[PDB]
């Protein structure tokens, strides 16, 4: 139980660090108490073991799986290329793309934690409860993943 | 059960056709009666639902999951980037590459069905029981997969 949360955070940090250094857009939504069943159906069901290697391969550009969101439920990568609700927020910075707006929209209707990697800048962002934390350091990302994903 | 096997066939056909037209080298071994857990242990575990989209994403070059073979066990992509033993056969044409020799090798020690996509020519090959069916057409690959995977 404790080890599953450790691997999940490590898999997220390693994968996003890889993609951030290569300007690879990413969109990983980790479900919590709410339940994102209807949003898992919108993509390709994987029900896969969580690994940093698989997360990297999913968001590779011009691939069948990169256009959408990875949804992590339980101890599995539930699906890839899934579609999340888009937030109509006017406060989200105009220079942020569809990935950030979809990450913001899912945080407004679920208690899930969502991670974003900008394909334009390589910055990492987080969304929770209708708010976005932009361009986080590895230390900031680690603290928030601990606070939100560890029970 | 019957739809799992036919979906497995479709996933292989669509993924290999996608990669053949782009000269993306691929190596897919489908286990049958002989266990391949020894070679699954050599790759990265996925335990993922079978789909053509995931097969395509795995074999994208210069990615963590691509360097090796995909092993399919039961109704799952068991592992990616797995090792397959190289046949010592001198009968295998020198025009072919390591993927073909690796497919031939596992076909000699298992009853598994293995699919190869040449990254040089795009041709689709097939190994079974020590035999090589080289550069098969789509109609050929379709009939072979039906006879050998639908039980
Ligand atoms: C629960 O997870 C942890 O405590 C944890 C600690 C360190 C790393 C490595 N950066 C990942 C995870």
From Swiss-Prot, chains A, B:
GO biological process per UniProt: cAMP biosynthetic process
The UniProt record lists the keyword Chloroplast: no
Gene source species: Listeria monocytogenes serovar 1/2a (strain ATCC BAA-679 / EGD-e)
Null allele phenotype: Essential, it cannot be deleted.
GO MF: adenylate cyclase activity; ATP binding; diadenylate cyclase activity
Enzyme class: transferase
Protein family (similarity comment): Belongs to the adenylate cyclase family. DacA/CdaA subfamily.
UniProtKB keywords: ATP-binding, Cell membrane, Membrane, Nucleotide-binding, Nucleotidyltransferase, Transferase, Transmembrane, Transmembrane helix
Protein name: Diadenylate cyclase
Stated role: Catalyzes the condensation of 2 ATP molecules into cyclic di-AMP (c-di-AMP). c-di-AMP is a signaling compound secreted into the host's cytosol where it triggers the cytosolic surveillance pathway (CSP), a host pathway of innate immunity characterized by expression of beta interferon (IFN-beta) and coregulated genes. Expression of truncated proteins (missing first 80 or 100 residues) in E.coli leads to c-di-AMP synthesis.
Enzyme Commission number: 2.7.7.85
Keyword Zinc-finger assigned: no
Localization terms from the record: Cell membrane
Cofactor: Co(2+)
Top-rank lineage group of the source organism: Bacteria
